[PDB]
From Swiss-Prot, chain A:
The gene is VP1. It comes from Human bocavirus 4. The chain holds residues 376 to 425 of 670 of the full protein. The lineage of its organism: Viruses, Monodnaviria, Shotokuvirae, Cossaviricota, Quintoviricetes. This is Minor capsid protein VP1. It comes from the Viruses. Belongs to the parvoviridae capsid protein family. Capsid proteins self-assembles to form an icosahedral capsid with a T=1 symmetry, about 26 nm in diameter, and consisting of 60 copies of three size variants of the capsid proteins, VP1, and VP3, which differ by the presence of an N-terminal extension in the minor protein VP1. The capsid has a channel at the 5-fold axis and there are densities extending the 5-fold axis into the interior of the capsid. The capsid encapsulates the genomic ssDNA. The N-terminus of Isoform Minor capsid protein VP1, VP1u, contains a phospholipase A2-like region. VP1u may play a role in the disruption of host tight junctions in the airway tract.
Amino acid sequence: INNERAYIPPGLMFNPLVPTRRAQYIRRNNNPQTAESTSRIAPYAKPTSW
Amino acid sequence: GSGVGISTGGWVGGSYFTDSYVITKNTRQFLVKIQNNHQYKTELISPSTSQGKSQRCVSTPWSYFNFNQYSSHFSPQDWQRLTNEYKRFRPKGMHVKIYNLQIKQILSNGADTTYNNDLTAGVHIFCDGEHAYPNATHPWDEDVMPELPYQTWYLFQYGYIPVIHELAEMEDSNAVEKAICLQIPFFMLENSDHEVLRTGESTEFTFNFDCEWINNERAYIPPGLMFNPLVPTRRAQYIRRNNNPQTAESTSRIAPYAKPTSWMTGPGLLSAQRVGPATSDTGAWMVAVKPENASIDTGMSGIGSGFDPPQGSLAPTNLEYKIQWYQTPQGTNNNGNIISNQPLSMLRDQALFRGNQTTYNLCSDVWMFPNQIWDRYPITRENPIWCKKPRSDKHTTIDPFDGSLAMDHPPGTIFIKMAKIPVPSNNNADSYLNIYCTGQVSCEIVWEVERYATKNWRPERRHTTFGLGIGGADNLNPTYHVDKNGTYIQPTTWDMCFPVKTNINKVL
Amino acid sequence: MTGPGLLSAQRVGPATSDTGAWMVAVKPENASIDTGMSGIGSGFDPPQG
Amino acid sequence: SLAPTNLEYKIQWYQTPQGTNNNGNIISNQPLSMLRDQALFRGNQTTYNLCSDVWMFPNQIWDRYPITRENPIWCKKPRSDKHTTIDPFDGSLAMDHP
Amino acid sequence: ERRHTTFGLGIGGADNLNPTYHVDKNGTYIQPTTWDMCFPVKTNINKVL
Amino acid sequence: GSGVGISTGGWVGGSYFTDSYVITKNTRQFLVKIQNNHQYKTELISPSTSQGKSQRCVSTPWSYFNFNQYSSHFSPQDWQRLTNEYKRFRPKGMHVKIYNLQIKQILSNGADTTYNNDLTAGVHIFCDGEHAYPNATHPWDEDVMPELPYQTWYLFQYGYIPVIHELAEMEDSNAVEKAICLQIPFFMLENSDHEVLRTGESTEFTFNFDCEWINNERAYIPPGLMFNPLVPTRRAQYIRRNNNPQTAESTSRIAPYAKPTSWMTGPGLLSAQRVGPATSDTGAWMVAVKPENASIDTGMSGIGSGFDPPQGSLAPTNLEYKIQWYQTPQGTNNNGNIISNQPLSMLRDQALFRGNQTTYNLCSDVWMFPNQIWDRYPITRENPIWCKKPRSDKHTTIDPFDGSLAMDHPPGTIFIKMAKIPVPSNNNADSYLNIYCTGQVSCEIVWEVERYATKNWRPERRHTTFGLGIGGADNLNPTYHVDKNGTYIQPTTWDMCFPVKTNINKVL
Amino acid sequence: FNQYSSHFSPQDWQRLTNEYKRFRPKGMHVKIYNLQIKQILSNGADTTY
Amino acid sequence: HELAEMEDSNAVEKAICLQIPFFMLENSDHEVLRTGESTEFTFNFDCEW
């Protein structure tokens, strides 16, 4: 039985300074607005497993 | 000999390829830039668009070596020599050598620049054997080694997220976000000891891997399709009264073909859709936290991380789940931008239907279930080799949907810094001497490899250059090759990069 | 907790058509498909377990 | 895991036989550990909507219940043919033979 | 990092005197009231994941 | 290897923590500035406000390493790991290494600057094993090592007071101040031999401590409160005739509770008040000298030293006795400015009353008395580790009220200088080449440490981060942590710094 | 015997909760001894042993 | 008793009230004796004349 604490979620482990090679396709929104577009994932908030 | 004027080690490379193992050797030229002065700060990154997540992070003077990717260690021929000729492979070990260091002492007279070289200067080099410290390496990221040697390798600053920025933002009150703000850990690479190196000195590092095989193999049929359709079956189908249109209930023997099966499809999550504008972290699945009180701004958003790709397995509906990457920092929205594709392996596709008493209707979710089989992501030459499995009490099967791998202890990240050299002043300080380092890393890794034999009569499939296509400048030069103009032409879409798991075959 | 099962589905259509109430199938991204579902993949039997 | 909505999921105990409905009655709380909270959202193409369930899934990580001094040390894992990961949500422990 | 102080504890029993884990006057062991009193593991130290 | 281009030693740190002992390791980057040309002078410091003390002192070309403080050798976690987990500790030994030296040869073309590095240059390094020489180190001072590594460490000039400036000022006459002026000693670090180092060379120093334990422990009751109050006592109280208001004399048995005690309170001096304006040395107790004739200006003042804090022990009346410090050179009158506080330990408070036949009246003084018990100052992470006990024929118990410690031979101060490199001229001289040194000190000290066991049923007390609080820039980041902006946030008031002696317990 | 508060004083607990990553019970040893059989008697009301 | 009495407020007497130690002679082991058994104890003195 482990007495220990994770100071961050497991999906929050990454260097936010470094850019990522990945992309986000976003479907046509079909109301309100903002038709579909693809874009690179921001350096912060990289996707995760886990 | 020893000292300045005597090179420490020579260049290395060229791979190997023996039936039992493959030794890939690589060497680079790198430079350390003195990031972030030598002080740390925090930096509270954000764009603005202040609605963004605005993770606070931490910046450090340190830079690190990221060796994690296949295209770094394998030439387009070395890859495709194993992808064609072997069932499976896993990295057995790793050996890294820093050597031939140089400290060049940037000078500025205004405009211009001058480099006086230097001696009597130093470079800090630190490795993680314990994987204490937040370990910057994330599977995709950028950089790693340039897939192409002779290409100088610029290191990137080391940073980490101490705590979620929201939840400790903090809003008035609170004492729930006061804690978690008080508890944010602060890590420093000074702490545990590490080596400093002048020019004449070098350093070696070794690594060993407790590691799962990555399999290059193909299932020619679904696992539920394995049976002799000629032989009749002993089994029966009761079918409930249809209650419109017609055809009252009846029992019947299952046809010799199309026998029932065990072996459920692999799990996936198909229902969600990515949410909102880009730069806001649209994952379609946010893990987050949600402590019981805390406080939260707009979001969701904005807390936690997007889960990508769901999937896994369970062939996706549209492009939104299909992964993607730009294989280039210059890549704009649509440019670079090679998109993952189906291997045509049968494992590995896995719809699920259920419904309706009348029609079958593809079902969202499909969580874990006892008999499930899925095939790990087929990867490709562009993928990260490994990913660190975070230490926790309990976990499930641990199959990352990025492909890659999970290890308790991956290769320890090698950190390197420029050894602040201060200069006197009246105030006094903060002032330091402007220098940079340059040298050669040789990453030599051994791959446990297994060679395939099969009873199939037919030719199976390999990776030709004919999947490749012509590009760059005036169209001349094909794909992996220089421009005129010379710029390495990047492979466009998925088949160019030659994925494992699309070749050979396996009887299930 | 109790053991897992799948109870929602119902076997679909006439006999000899492989009515499993759960079809695993494949669905590659393009391909082409006739009537079905049906007709691709295998019925999962018994759900339960 | 999967931080609860209201008190109804939050466990509770009276740490006393004399404990009436509200008396004794110490209630479990969040450790503030980050593992260990774990919402999940999905939805909507527009908004995220906290989702019920979340069954087992390949990449999952959770943190075993933080327990406390008042908890049972162990629990007997009943003999059966098949079972899953076996993490009791009371904290405690599972053993073939306690 | 973080530890378990008695300051998480609080005074109770009879006339309020005696803090928490302690006898009453009257002596009856004062019981810890709510969760932090009982000192849970996993709220302390830290681990790099 | 050896010579330029081969680093002499690597970085070190990270502490240790075994039950029997704790090994703290630290490393720094320092620079020596060539203070005071290479000549000595005297400098007759003073402000003006000519009424001030105007100590004459002496300046030297030398700089010195001050290792004396706890916050230098212990991270905020290492401290609080021993403060929570151990009864007592004392430094067992000390090992210091100068290495990775650099001589950078300042140049000025006007405005700007340039640093050509240098070779064939040297650095003088001298240590005191005998503690001859005036030994600059004073417990509080400034500087020491920066509590935070990676922070370059600027050395400070070595100087000393040869003789009290007044008494030898001297006024007309005198022959009483003519002597004591003639007898002022003049110390020089050239004298006894010492090592010079070019770049490739390094130096080590070791130290051993004959040293008293510093105890982290708490008395839950006064020493006079130890008795079984249930059991009756055999003793009696005669009480004199009251002579107003009433109640003529009577004898009676002492109540079972509140039995008399031995064990007087520790000594203190509470009567005095600090005298006059700041910068005039207001101590509230001046030791001075007063030779029989001499001559003296205004003052008191102005001769001798203020005694601080009185106290000791004997809980103070107002802030004036409560010590204080700014934990920062930028600290203004009220800023920084963390003030000492009561440990809530019961030893350690110690009023005394006497009086009146009617009322008790808190009494000034309380000198030494046979049965006295007091508790040494609880210290904290910010305190000096040791103080040198001056050599003299006779002395009393020797408990410094700054906490710290007294030793016959403390760690010998390590002195370092830039090795004057002259340049030819016609006059000729005085002229020299402008250089500075840079390098790395590693102070690795071993701590005899003892771990606590007790029969108490109850949880006792520890040091949480919850005593800590949020600060810096926009309020984000808690306490020991970087700003954004990164500047290490300083702990504000007393509990932040985690004092020993406020935890555990001890049966007296 | 199953509970932590039975085997750990409020200080023993919090000595491990503060000072250790992890713990599991390694072994257990139980001893019944100093037995007494007191033979309840009732003459009505009262009691005698 | 005073100083932890405690008067309204306080948090200065709240501490020193929270920190009151509670000692129990059960704790450390000791001998039980029926009739037939006995016990010896010895002591040595570092002591002034």
